[PDB]
Design an enzyme around this catalytic site. Structure first.
Site, PDB file in Angstrom:
ATOM      1  N   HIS A 170     -67.853 -18.571  38.497  1.00  0.00           N
ATOM      2  CA  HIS A 170     -68.565 -19.730  37.987  1.00  0.00           C
ATOM      3  C   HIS A 170     -68.295 -21.031  38.752  1.00  0.00           C
ATOM      4  CE1 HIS A 170     -69.396 -18.334  33.649  1.00  0.00           C
ATOM      5  NE2 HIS A 170     -69.793 -17.469  34.520  1.00  0.00           N
ATOM      6  N   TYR A 218     -69.130 -26.153  26.361  1.00  0.00           N
ATOM      7  CA  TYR A 218     -68.190 -26.645  25.353  1.00  0.00           C
ATOM      8  C   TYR A 218     -68.885 -27.700  24.519  1.00  0.00           C
ATOM      9  CZ  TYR A 218     -64.218 -24.814  27.975  1.00  0.00           C
ATOM     10  OH  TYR A 218     -63.300 -24.076  28.636  1.00  0.00           O
ATOM     11  N   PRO A 244     -56.178 -23.259  23.711  1.00  0.00           N
ATOM     12  CA  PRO A 244     -57.038 -22.636  24.704  1.00  0.00           C
ATOM     13  C   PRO A 244     -58.198 -23.459  25.247  1.00  0.00           C
ATOM     14  CG  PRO A 244     -57.436 -21.745  22.537  1.00  0.00           C
ATOM     15  CD  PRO A 244     -56.173 -22.550  22.436  1.00  0.00           C
ATOM     16  N   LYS A 292     -55.936 -22.859  30.214  1.00  0.00           N
ATOM     17  CA  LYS A 292     -54.701 -22.882  30.999  1.00  0.00           C
ATOM     18  C   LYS A 292     -53.605 -21.837  30.701  1.00  0.00           C
ATOM     19  CE  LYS A 292     -56.442 -25.314  33.200  1.00  0.00           C
ATOM     20  NZ  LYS A 292     -56.635 -24.680  34.496  1.00  0.00           N
ATOM     21  N   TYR A 305     -59.280 -28.443  35.738  1.00  0.00           N
ATOM     22  CA  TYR A 305     -59.914 -27.236  35.252  1.00  0.00           C
ATOM     23  C   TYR A 305     -59.756 -26.106  36.269  1.00  0.00           C
ATOM     24  CZ  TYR A 305     -63.027 -24.551  32.331  1.00  0.00           C
ATOM     25  OH  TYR A 305     -63.495 -23.600  31.446  1.00  0.00           O
TER      26      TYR A 305
HETATM   27  C1  LIG Z   1     -58.100 -17.426  21.440  1.00  0.00           C
HETATM   28  C2  LIG Z   1     -57.370 -17.431  22.735  1.00  0.00           C
HETATM   29  C3  LIG Z   1     -58.056 -17.648  23.860  1.00  0.00           C
HETATM   30  C4  LIG Z   1     -57.467 -17.768  25.122  1.00  0.00           C
HETATM   31  N1  LIG Z   1     -58.313 -17.938  26.119  1.00  0.00           N
HETATM   32  C5  LIG Z   1     -57.697 -18.117  27.285  1.00  0.00           C
HETATM   33  C6  LIG Z   1     -58.538 -18.335  28.473  1.00  0.00           C
HETATM   34  O1  LIG Z   1     -59.743 -18.249  28.636  1.00  0.00           O
HETATM   35  N2  LIG Z   1     -57.838 -18.603  29.614  1.00  0.00           N
HETATM   36  C7  LIG Z   1     -56.456 -18.687  29.740  1.00  0.00           C
HETATM   37  O2  LIG Z   1     -55.910 -19.030  30.766  1.00  0.00           O
HETATM   38  N3  LIG Z   1     -55.728 -18.468  28.645  1.00  0.00           N
HETATM   39  C8  LIG Z   1     -56.336 -18.185  27.479  1.00  0.00           C
HETATM   40  N4  LIG Z   1     -55.527 -17.809  26.420  1.00  0.00           N
HETATM   41  C9  LIG Z   1     -54.092 -17.594  26.610  1.00  0.00           C
HETATM   42  C10 LIG Z   1     -53.677 -16.182  27.066  1.00  0.00           C
HETATM   43  O3  LIG Z   1     -54.307 -15.263  26.173  1.00  0.00           O
HETATM   44  C11 LIG Z   1     -52.138 -16.014  26.994  1.00  0.00           C
HETATM   45  O4  LIG Z   1     -51.440 -17.124  27.607  1.00  0.00           O
HETATM   46  C12 LIG Z   1     -51.610 -14.629  27.448  1.00  0.00           C
HETATM   47  O5  LIG Z   1     -51.835 -13.563  26.497  1.00  0.00           O
HETATM   48  C13 LIG Z   1     -50.128 -14.719  27.913  1.00  0.00           C
HETATM   49  O6  LIG Z   1     -49.514 -13.550  28.471  1.00  0.00           O
HETATM   50  P1  LIG Z   1     -48.013 -13.038  28.118  1.00  0.00           P
HETATM   51  O7  LIG Z   1     -47.914 -11.702  28.708  1.00  0.00           O
HETATM   52  O8  LIG Z   1     -47.102 -14.087  28.589  1.00  0.00           O
HETATM   53  O9  LIG Z   1     -47.878 -12.975  26.567  1.00  0.00           O
HETATM   54  P2  LIG Z   1     -48.666 -11.999  25.612  1.00  0.00           P
HETATM   55  O10 LIG Z   1     -49.955 -11.724  26.185  1.00  0.00           O
HETATM   56  O11 LIG Z   1     -48.527 -12.554  24.253  1.00  0.00           O
HETATM   57  O12 LIG Z   1     -47.824 -10.675  25.672  1.00  0.00           O
HETATM   58  C14 LIG Z   1     -46.443 -10.507  25.252  1.00  0.00           C
HETATM   59  C15 LIG Z   1     -46.078  -9.045  24.831  1.00  0.00           C
HETATM   60  O13 LIG Z   1     -44.724  -8.882  24.456  1.00  0.00           O
HETATM   61  C16 LIG Z   1     -44.573  -8.014  23.367  1.00  0.00           C
HETATM   62  N5  LIG Z   1     -43.384  -8.415  22.635  1.00  0.00           N
HETATM   63  C17 LIG Z   1     -43.256  -9.381  21.667  1.00  0.00           C
HETATM   64  N6  LIG Z   1     -42.137  -9.344  21.012  1.00  0.00           N
HETATM   65  C18 LIG Z   1     -41.455  -8.277  21.583  1.00  0.00           C
HETATM   66  C19 LIG Z   1     -40.190  -7.732  21.363  1.00  0.00           C
HETATM   67  N7  LIG Z   1     -39.298  -8.154  20.448  1.00  0.00           N
HETATM   68  N8  LIG Z   1     -39.866  -6.696  22.152  1.00  0.00           N
HETATM   69  C20 LIG Z   1     -40.708  -6.260  23.057  1.00  0.00           C
HETATM   70  N9  LIG Z   1     -41.904  -6.673  23.375  1.00  0.00           N
HETATM   71  C21 LIG Z   1     -42.220  -7.707  22.581  1.00  0.00           C
HETATM   72  C22 LIG Z   1     -45.839  -8.222  22.556  1.00  0.00           C
HETATM   73  O14 LIG Z   1     -46.058  -7.149  21.561  1.00  0.00           O
HETATM   74  C23 LIG Z   1     -46.872  -8.456  23.685  1.00  0.00           C
HETATM   75  O15 LIG Z   1     -47.435  -7.303  24.258  1.00  0.00           O
HETATM   76  C24 LIG Z   1     -56.123 -17.658  25.185  1.00  0.00           C
HETATM   77  C25 LIG Z   1     -55.396 -17.420  24.020  1.00  0.00           C
HETATM   78  C26 LIG Z   1     -55.969 -17.306  22.829  1.00  0.00           C
HETATM   79  C27 LIG Z   1     -55.068 -17.055  21.673  1.00  0.00           C
END
Ligand SMILES: Cc1cc2nc3c(=O)[nH]c(=O)nc-3n(C[C@H](O)[C@H](O)[C@H](O)COP(=O)(O)OP(=O)(O)OC[C@H]3O[C@@H](n4cnc5c(N)ncnc54)[C@H](O)[C@@H]3O)c2cc1C
Ligand SMILES: Cc1cc2nc3c(=O)[nH]c(=O)nc-3n(C[C@H](O)[C@H](O)[C@H](O)COP(=O)(O)OP(=O)(O)OC[C@H]3O[C@@H](n4cnc5c(N)ncnc54)[C@H](O)[C@@H]3O)c2cc1C
Lengths: 394, 394
Positions: free
Chosen positions: A72, A201, A293, A297, A385
């Site tokens: 995009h 948006y 969100p 970021k 952005y």
């Molecule tokens: C509605 C929504 C929309 C979003 N849209 C965007 C977007 O367009 N662009 C963008 O950049 N970001 C967006 N985000 C953010 C993005 O989804 C997250 O930052 C992302 O999931 C982060 O990755 P992570 O692996 O760090 O954490 P997570 O994806 O949360 O993964 C962490 C993992 O660790 C596991 N875990 C937790 N506790 C334990 C434990 N005790 N032992 C072992 N494992 C454990 C969990 O079960 C999980 O699988 C959005 C978020 C939301 C909520």
């Protein structure tokens, strides 16, 4: 049992750190509380930036994104009858953003890790972290009733906001910065062609709305909803009517609606912890920081944390220069606080706030009329952005 | 008695409207509650922009400003050990700001009006405004006990925040937008050479400070002070010590201090009223809108209101096209709300706020680290600081 790096969590952050390291000859084990299936049910993110596109290529997992992801070049903001496009390609010097769903990103890395044979233990219960300031840390956990020991050199907490690893640090060695917002995003994923080629948006009187996409035949829609609400009260019908009530009439008439595939309410939050490390434990991604969100970021900060953590761990194993891993937090937090300010400004100009007085509504709109009608004002949104530059390491 | 335009108030706004109109053959009378002497005691403003420089030349009163005013090309912001310069000439395309005191500006216009013989009644008591929606309004007032009638065609309320003319409008026809801030600026004018060739604005832990100037041998200094304070508690000594406590050490050591010529506390306020007119009454300047002085915008809005009011009144008398004076408010308010947002952003990033929590201090600093380290971020401050363009009329 033994490994070089232990990674707690198999979402975008655990898997990308894990992959990059396996390719560099550095062994690692991932530990995940849930199942492969439960991790893949989480719809989350649609928008990726250049840093995360380049890293997925560095880990050789870019194939399906190069065919299927959508490049995009602009996004639109709707406010007060108006409808204004930010051209991101030219207000930032050639940068673009990539639309590719988080479910898909995670699937590509779960398939890649599986092919190389690197260790993953899903359903690992009650992970505990021990001996963090010593020279030989370890993770205890339970696999099917049996309590097992995993020894490593270093531990990466890639386990999200609710993960055990930030709570595994002495609370006095930590400074928490937080803001809870009085709303959430009600989301709804449909197997319908999106309402526009680009993301819209919208700041509307009734509250926020966002028109996103997952591909040419799949759509992601949100409306801002109060902290009181619960998804069972929002029928697909209810939602579509309210989403149409919040759009420019000539967008709402062009809307193709359909039954939800997924419906859920995410609360909004800004969260930072400083430091992002304790001894041999390094927090990455959502373990260390939450952004609302609105600015897309979350995965921008996971990729630079992970890029920085990988780059310093290579230096530590390939090069013996292991002193540099105490530079981790200071390198990461410079990038976290600029993406946190961008995520708050975004959030506050586009959502409707409780007991806002006459003066602040007027300022909020004037904010939007300025940043969108000024070349320089537009460039401040656009370079933020598409993601700012990455930091010098050495 | 009779005139064409009656102007209530002889500060920068009453006098400049008055002068421009006398030069165009349009007669006017000014009415002022105070004395010439009391009006000149008010030290106020040091920074002027291009619109107000060009208007003072249009009214042929530019002479002493062209010799004595100071053209400035940059300003500095001090925050967290750092000290950053915004080059206003190149981040805005050649625009500069003019340092020339408000006492002086007022003196030039009081001397000019006196030479041409246009009417001014100082010490005019209890001005009342009558018959505003009729075709023949009038001002009653008292000169030395005698209650006199002045008939006009049109009335300009150039009488400040406390002036009678905004209170002369039915309160239901008005929408007030206001924000009171929990601080004031303690100011102190000294006959000392300034601490820098340019103005320094400073965000310090203890609260705000500003290093300004009136000429090579006169200085204007402020510190942010709580709403509780009173000037008799701040001795010159007390002040200089606190101002030095709030500056970078290598600025504070270079400071030449001396006895105050003037010392006073101005409260901070954002105020807008919409509409800016009622019938034959048109509010201009501070009668219609207040900004906190942090962005140097008060006289920027007085000049465009006055420029717009003059330009529409010429059209009304020279050209018979008198319908256009109902376009007054809509033309003015577009400019008032962008300078009001700039004045609030400025204010909130540079002052210390009561019961600010950990997260907002961090955001406030990150605001400053972004806007000052980004080309586009800097240009948003610079084009706002030098004044945005003026609006199309027809
Ligand atoms: C509605 C929504 C929309 C979003 N849209 C965007 C977007 O367009 N662009 C963008 O950049 N970001 C967006 N985000 C953010 C993005 O989804 C997250 O930052 C992302 O999931 C982060 O990755 P992570 O692996 O760090 O954490 P997570 O994806 O949360 O993964 C962490 C993992 O660790 C596991 N875990 C937790 N506790 C334990 C434990 N005790 N032992 C072992 N494992 C454990 C969990 O079960 C999980 O699988 C959005 C978020 C939301 C909520
Ligand atoms: C501390 C401070 C610093 C500032 N610094 C700057 C700066 O650097 N740059 C900048 O752009 N702006 C600055 N300003 C703002 C600037 O001083 C004002 O916007 C300016 O004085 C406005 O002009 P005015 O003629 O509209 O109103 P005023 O200057 O307030 O004059 C109105 C006049 O009307 C008279 N009047 C009131 N009531 C009546 C009545 N009933 N009948 C008759 N006459 C009446 C008053 O006695 C007065 O003479 C500063 C203000 C303050 C307080």
């Amino acid at each position: 049992m033994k490994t070089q790096v232990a990674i707690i969590g198999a979402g975008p952050s655990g898997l990308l750190l894990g992959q990059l390291l396996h390719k560099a000859g550095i062994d690692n084990v991932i530990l995940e509380r849930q199942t492969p299936d439960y991790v893949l049910g989480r719809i989350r993110a649609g928008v990726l930036e250049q840093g995360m596109v380049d890293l997925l290529r560095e880990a050789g997992v870019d194939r399906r994104m190069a065919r299927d992801g959508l490049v995009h070049e602009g996004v639109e903001i709707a406010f007060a009858g108006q409808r204004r496009r930010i051209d991101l390609k030219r207000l930032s010097g050639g940068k673009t953003v990539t639309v590719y769903g988080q479910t898909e990103v995670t699937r590509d890395l779960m398939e890649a890790r599986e092919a190389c044979g690197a260790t993953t233990v899903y359903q690992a219960a009650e992970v505990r972290l021990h001996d963090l300031q010593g020279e030989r840390p370890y993770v205890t956990f339970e696999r099917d009733g049996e309590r097992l020991r995993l020894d490593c050199d270093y531990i990466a907490g890639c386990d999200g906001f609710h993960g055990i690893s930030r709570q595994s640090i002495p609370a006095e060695r930590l400074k928490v910065f937080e803001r809870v917002y009085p709303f959430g995003w009600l989301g709804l994923l449909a197997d319908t062609p999106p309402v526009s080629h680009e993301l819209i948006y919208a700041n509307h009187p009734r509250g926020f709305a966002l028109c996103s996409q997952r591909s040419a035949t799949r759509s992601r829609y949100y409306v801002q909803v109060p902290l009181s609400e619960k998804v069972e009260d929002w029928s697909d019908e209810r939602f579509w009517t309210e989403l149409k009530a919040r759009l420019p009439s000539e967008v709402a008439e062009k809307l193709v609606t359909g039954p939800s595939l997924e419906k859920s309410i995410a609360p909004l939050r800004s969260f930072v912890v400083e430091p992002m490390q304790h001894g041999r434990l390094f927090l990455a991604g959502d373990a260390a920081h939450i952004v609302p969100p609105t600015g897309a970021k979350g995965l921008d900060l996971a990729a630079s944390d992970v890029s920085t953590l990988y780059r310093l761990l290579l230096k530590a194993y390939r090069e013996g220069r292991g002193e540099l891993l105490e530079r981790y937090s200071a390198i990461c937090l410079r990038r976290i606080w600029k993406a946190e300010r961008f995520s708050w400004w975004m959030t506050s100009v586009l959502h409707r706030f409780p007991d806002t007085d006459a003066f602040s509504q007027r300022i909020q709109q004037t904010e939007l009329e300025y940043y969108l009608g000024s070349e320089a004002g537009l460039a401040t949104i656009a370079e933020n952005y598409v993601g700012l530059p990455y930091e010098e390491i050495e």
